[PDB]
Design an enzyme around this catalytic site. Structure first.
Site, PDB file in Angstrom:
ATOM      1  N   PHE B 216     -55.616   5.618  -2.773  1.00  0.00           N
ATOM      2  CA  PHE B 216     -55.203   4.685  -3.817  1.00  0.00           C
ATOM      3  C   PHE B 216     -54.029   5.233  -4.619  1.00  0.00           C
ATOM      4  O   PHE B 216     -54.059   6.383  -5.075  1.00  0.00           O
ATOM      5  CB  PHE B 216     -56.371   4.390  -4.760  1.00  0.00           C
ATOM      6  CG  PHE B 216     -57.405   3.491  -4.179  1.00  0.00           C
ATOM      7  CD1 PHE B 216     -58.744   3.837  -4.229  1.00  0.00           C
ATOM      8  CD2 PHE B 216     -57.049   2.283  -3.613  1.00  0.00           C
ATOM      9  CE1 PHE B 216     -59.709   3.000  -3.700  1.00  0.00           C
ATOM     10  CE2 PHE B 216     -58.007   1.442  -3.080  1.00  0.00           C
ATOM     11  CZ  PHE B 216     -59.338   1.805  -3.120  1.00  0.00           C
ATOM     12  N   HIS B 310     -52.362  -6.194   4.131  1.00  0.00           N
ATOM     13  CA  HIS B 310     -52.785  -5.235   3.122  1.00  0.00           C
ATOM     14  C   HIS B 310     -53.207  -3.941   3.801  1.00  0.00           C
ATOM     15  O   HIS B 310     -54.131  -3.960   4.624  1.00  0.00           O
ATOM     16  CB  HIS B 310     -53.933  -5.763   2.278  1.00  0.00           C
ATOM     17  CG  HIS B 310     -54.538  -4.721   1.391  1.00  0.00           C
ATOM     18  ND1 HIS B 310     -53.903  -4.248   0.263  1.00  0.00           N
ATOM     19  CD2 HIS B 310     -55.710  -4.045   1.475  1.00  0.00           C
ATOM     20  CE1 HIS B 310     -54.666  -3.335  -0.318  1.00  0.00           C
ATOM     21  NE2 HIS B 310     -55.764  -3.187   0.404  1.00  0.00           N
ATOM     22  N   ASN B 343     -52.158   2.900  -1.117  1.00  0.00           N
ATOM     23  CA  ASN B 343     -52.871   1.639  -1.244  1.00  0.00           C
ATOM     24  C   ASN B 343     -52.864   1.262  -2.719  1.00  0.00           C
ATOM     25  O   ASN B 343     -53.634   1.806  -3.514  1.00  0.00           O
ATOM     26  CB  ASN B 343     -54.279   1.782  -0.672  1.00  0.00           C
ATOM     27  CG  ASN B 343     -55.153   0.557  -0.908  1.00  0.00           C
ATOM     28  OD1 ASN B 343     -54.745  -0.403  -1.553  1.00  0.00           O
ATOM     29  ND2 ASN B 343     -56.370   0.596  -0.377  1.00  0.00           N
TER      30      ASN B 343
END
Lengths: 399, 396
Positions: B216, B310, B343
């Site tokens: 992330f 994504h 991400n």
């Protein structure tokens, strides 16, 4: 170049009529709290009976709240097993979350089942879900949870509205309007579900605005089915959504703030909320009526000649709007009735009022679903200070 | 069942498809090299004694497909907040203090770039859609953004909280109906994500939380969406033609997230790349039928559309590629953003969209979508939810 490929026909066909309320259902938790004696219960369970002066103030707040009873998921047994929720300021969020992540979609499902039964169409015809709550958050959201509980199609198009507050009854009407109108065949399940388990806390002598919240907020869920182009002889229209607007009212920074903390959801009042709303509501409504009706003579309804659905954030808001606009006292009656029977259920309130308005209109054999009037207003107020305005049309009834 | 006599739609609707008119992005200033992130991470969480776990984490980072990430957090902020460097300490309050300020701030940076490209007065923005998975507040980040930009106090706002990684597709679906049903509507869409709510120290018995620490990153992206572009004034880049949402089969509990007193916690319980890659073909077959029909020579192959997927992690892209039989070029734009940013949850797909059109212009390709007319934007997240959007590019 602003060049583009050759146009194609709209790939997802749109509808032509206005978004229409086709059914309404409501539900509340099973534990009933008489407001007259809520101070006794509240100061007992928060172990605060030595705060004799503060209890007197809280009895005054309750007596002046315009509320007769409230429904809550909480009860004495749950509260006693969770002393951190009975304190004013102890770490709690985890147990509050454990409750509301389960109970808000549960209550929403109860309201949705009733709306779907009234609608009379199979569940599989729901294409969109809008779920609105200010009570907890989770991933997947309550929208997913409701989808599973009801057994809707796994391809429903969901919108999850978390942490929005008291104006969001108006917001979901505004959201459902575009979903229904821009999509032929779309049938939108809108569910608002609110529980005080996130905000309940003990009393503090230095936080009277948090205490007011303890006197006002109750639990409830409401559900509606919204679609355009109702199927003749199959579906039944009740209200039409014709205009929507949103306004951050002037000079209103910090009027209503809420923070999700380790001690739960805190609630803060720092400006004269009924004063700000009543000072500005006239221009909000004058603009909305101009957009809907124009301004030729004899073509614009007076405020006394439309039906009113007003979020009863507290009795003072309704009182001061009624005073400022010189409404006859029957205009706010329906909104006051729901406040009396349920308290402030945050986003769910305005749909309870809508349901009460049509049911009273049918029982009293009035000419329309909105008290005999063709046009009406639905108003939500909350943090911002945000005012959500919705202009509705009723449906004619046999008198 | 009676109604009053029909009247003309009181708020006039638009006639053309919803169109992306501008894109802007932004990231916090602290850059983290992925090859040495295990050093930084195990130092700042005081976990150097977990020697075997660090080896595992170095492997995860080496194989992450990520070269660098941007974060609001840094060494200084983390040293001041030891409760965020622990695996499981009460922290929510300080995490919230950071993200309720910083996610609208980062969104404002991306929004200002989009608005400048768009070139129109900011008072022409009629709607705001704000999406984040990082913190909650009342009034929300939509209100904060409205104040920071000086938008009209009558903007119609939609605040999308605690959404998760599919919501980049969701906001496209939301903006579509807003733009198309409202003539003159110009929708400012902002996704802004910060890892400050999820960052935590490592646990040798919760390796799935360790996954998030490798993948992330932070970022915000903003688009202006509107139907019926003003001729010779606004510039279309992509058109939104079809949207769908699907909860994939047998995915219950695959990705859960809970907002707790220790912050936002991240749970993986099924084969997420497997569930996505094994079910995506049926989802896309349905969308292609709805958009193009079923006739020989009328339906483009998956190799002949552009892809905005994504990048939840490299395994999702790899297995989708294999299960759909994509040539390796199809996932390149999505892989490029994963490499440059990690991400960024809901914000990712709009970064990929921006990269795609920018690479198309600089390589003098035929369309804003790598030379292809039609394309896909896909978001994946808790549910397991798949959000599908069929887009059209514009000729260059």
């Amino acid at each position: 170049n602003g060049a583009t490929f050759p146009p194609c026909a709209r790939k997802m066909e749109r509808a032509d009529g206005p978004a229409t309320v086709l059914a309404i259902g409501t539900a509340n938790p099973p534990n009933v709290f008489d407001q007259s004696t809520y101070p006794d219960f509240y100061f007992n369970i928060t172990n605060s009976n030595h705060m004799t002066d503060l209890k007197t103030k809280f009895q005054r707040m309750c007596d002046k709240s315009g509320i007769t009873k409230r429904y809550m998921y909480l009860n004495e047994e749950i509260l006693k097993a969770n002393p951190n929720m009975c304190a004013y300021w102890e770490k709690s969020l985890d147990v509050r979350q454990d409750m509301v992540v389960v109970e808000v979609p549960k209550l929403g499902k109860e309201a949705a089942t009733k709306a779907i039964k009234e609608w009379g169409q199979p569940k599989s015809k729901i294409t969109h879900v809008v779920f609105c709550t200010t009570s907890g958050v989770d991933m997947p959201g309550a929208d997913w949870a409701l989808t599973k509980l009801l057994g809707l199609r796994p391809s429903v198009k969901r919108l999850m509205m978390y942490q929005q507050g008291c104006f969001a009854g108006g917001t979901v009407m505004r959201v459902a309007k575009d979903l229904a109108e821009n999509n032929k065949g779309a049938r939108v399940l809108v569910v608002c579900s609110e529980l005080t388990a996130v905000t309940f806390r003990g009393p503090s002598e230095t936080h009277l605005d948090s205490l007011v919240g303890q006197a006002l907020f109750g639990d409830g869920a409401s559900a509606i089915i919204v679609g355009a182009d109702p199927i003749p002889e199959v579906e039944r229209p009740w209200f039409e959504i014709h205009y929507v607007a949103s306004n951050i009212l002037p000079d209103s920074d910090g009027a209503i703030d809420g923070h999700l903390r380790e001690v739960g959801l805190t609630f803060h009042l720092m400006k004269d909320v009924p004063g700000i709303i009543s000072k500005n509501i006239g221009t909000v409504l004058k603009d909305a009526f101009e957009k809907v009706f124009g301004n030729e003579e004899g073509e614009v309804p007076s405020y006394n000649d439309v039906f009113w659905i007003a979020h009863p954030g507290g009795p003072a808001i309704l009182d001061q709007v009624e005073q400022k606009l010189q409404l006859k006292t029957e205009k706010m009656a329906a909104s006051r009735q729901v406040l009396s029977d349920y308290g402030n259920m945050s986003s769910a309130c305005v749909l309870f009022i809508m349901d009460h308005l049509r049911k009273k209109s049918v029982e009293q054999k009035l000419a329309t679903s909105g008290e005999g009037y063709e046009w009406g207003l639905l108003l939500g107020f909350g943090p911002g200070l945000t005012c959500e305005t919705v202009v509705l049309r009723s449906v004619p009834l046999a008198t």
